[PDB]
Amino acid sequence: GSSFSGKYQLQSQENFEAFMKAIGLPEELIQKGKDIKGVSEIVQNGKHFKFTITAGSKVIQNEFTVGEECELETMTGEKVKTVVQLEGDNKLVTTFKNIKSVTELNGDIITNTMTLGDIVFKRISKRIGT
Ligand SMILES: CCCCCCCCCCCCCCCC(=O)O
Ligand SMILES: CCCCCCCCCCCCCCCC(=O)O
């Protein structure tokens, strides 16, 4: 099962700066990263996920098995222990550091919503070939 598999590129995002400041991303990376159209590569094999996020020079690789403890490297470099769940074939949900993350695939469009208190950081990405 491979619902999420593919390569997607950011089209637009809301509240990037406010969110990244809140979480402790260095200001130099915030300013150089706010206009980056990052690429996310996902390989789904049943419950087993691997994803690679590229933004400029910076590459972050992560993996998890749905419903199990995993260790996710966040944008700051902090690795967090959490559990990622599926809510249907096309929705991944997790919470770490009081952030709720929801990743939802609709055809070729992935919407990622990260909520930290009143800050709702929304990213919309579009499939880019294979
Ligand atoms: C060293 C060159 C500067 C570029 C590095 C800036 C870091 C950009 C990272 C922010 C992109 C946000 C990715 C989050 C993806 C997600 O929603 O899970
Ligand atoms: C890297 C920080 C951890 C993010 C927590 C969500 C983990 C489950 C989602 C994995 C799919 C990744 C899709 C990212 C799409 C995007 O770039 O906005």
Swiss-Prot record:
Give yes or no: UniProt keyword Acetylation: yes
Please give the residue positions where the record annotates the modification Phosphothreonine: T52
Entry's Gene Ontology BP terms: cellular detoxification; cellular response to hydrogen peroxide; cellular response to hypoxia; fatty acid transport
Highest taxon in the source lineage:
Eukaryota
Protein localization: Cytoplasm
Q: Which residues carry this modification: N6-succinyllysine?
A: K32, K37, K47, K58, K79, K91, K122
Alphabetical UniProt keywords: Acetylation, Cytoplasm, Lipid-binding, Phosphoprotein, Transport
What Pfam families does the database record attribute to this sequence? Lipocalin_7
Q: Does the keyword Acetylation apply?
A: yes
Where on the chain is Phosphoserine found, per UniProt?
A: S12, S40, S57, S101
Please list which residues make up the signal peptide: none
GO cellular component terms listed in the entry, alphabetical order: cytosol; extracellular exosome; nucleoplasm; nucleus; peroxisomal matrix
Among the GO molecular function terms of this UniProt record, one is: antioxidant activity
User: What is the role of the protein in this entry?
Assistant: Plays a role in lipoprotein-mediated cholesterol uptake in hepatocytes. Binds cholesterol. Binds free fatty acids and their coenzyme A derivatives, bilirubin, and some other small molecules in the cytoplasm. May be involved in intracellular lipid transport.
Protein family = Belongs to the calycin superfamily. Fatty-acid binding protein (FABP) family.
**Notes on the domains:** Forms a beta-barrel structure that accommodates hydrophobic ligands in its interior.
What's the protein name?
Answer: Fatty acid-binding protein, liver
What species is this protein from? Homo sapiens (Human)
Q: Which classification does the entry list for the species? A: Eukaryota, Metazoa, Chordata, Craniata, Vertebrata
